[PDB]
Amino acid sequence: GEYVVAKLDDLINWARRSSLWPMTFGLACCAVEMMHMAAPRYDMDRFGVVFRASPRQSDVMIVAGTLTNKMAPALRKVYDQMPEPRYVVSMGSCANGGGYYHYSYSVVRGCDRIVPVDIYVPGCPPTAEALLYGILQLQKKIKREKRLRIWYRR
């Protein structure tokens, strides 16, 4: 039976990582490099990552830019609306830890104070390629999941 569960886990993992539909929170300059990842040279859609998805149809949230205090409740509301399984990719220094604005009165010092984060992409901004590296790193993280294996040992 362990052979069947291991194969079933592999199938659902393959489907979920082969079909990552992102909801992009294009908050600032990091959104532009996200655009260049959707652009022809890198074509994120060729990996099965559609260009744009509504929050209720998205599998991954990409926080691409500075998260201010005024914005934080809105971002948390959208995260709570995502169907599961859901993942968060934090892109750029601002989202990772506040970046250039870490010491400002109006900025959240890292989006991981508001939502759990799966992947941190460094850079100000990360290059389009660097973000793509992070997405492919998220895929490998999903490939490691063993949800059904852990379910049947409960």
Ligand X SMILES: CCCCCCCCCCCCO[C@@H]1O[C@H](CO)[C@@H](O[C@H]2O[C@H](CO)[C@@H](O)[C@H](O)[C@H]2O)[C@H](O)[C@H]1O
Ligand Y SMILES: N=C(N)NC(=N)NCCc1ccc(I)c(Cl)c1
Ligand Z SMILES: CCCCCCCCCCCCCCCCCC(=O)OC[C@H](COP(=O)([O-])OCC[N+](C)(C)C)OC(=O)CCCCCCCCCCCCCCCCC
Could you tell me the two tokens for 21?
């539909």
Least distance CB 129 / ligand SF4 (angstroms): 15
Longest dimension (CA), the chain: 56
Q: Are 28 and 94 in contact, with CB atoms under 8 Å apart?
A: yes
User: How far is the C-alpha of 23 from the C-alpha of 33, rounded, in Å?
Assistant: 15
Could you tell me the two tokens for 101?
């604005």
Question: Which of ligand Y, ligand X, ligand Z, none binds 84 (CB below 5-8 Å, type-dependent)?
Answer: ligand X
CA 53 to chain centre: 13
Number of residues that bind ligand Y (CB under 6 A): 3
Q: 87: which strand partners?
A: 60
Options 96, 107, 108, 115; binder of another protein; rule CB under 8 A: 96
When the beta carbons of 58 and 66 are compared against ligand Y, the nearer one is: 58
SS3 70: coil
Options 5, 10, 97, 130; binder of ligand Z; rule CB under 6 A: 10
Site of interaction with ligand X (CB under 6 A): 12, 84-85, 147
User: How far is the C-alpha of 29 from the C-alpha of 93, rounded, in Å?
Assistant: 11
Q: Which amino acids are annotated as binding site, given as ranges?
A: 29-30, 94, 124
Footprint on this chain of another protein (rule: CB under 8 A): 11-12, 14-16, 18-19, 28-29, 39-43, 45-48, 56-57, 59, 83-85, 93, 96-100, 102-103, 110, 112, 117-124, 126-130, 132-134, 136-137, 140-141, 143-144, 147-148, 151, 154
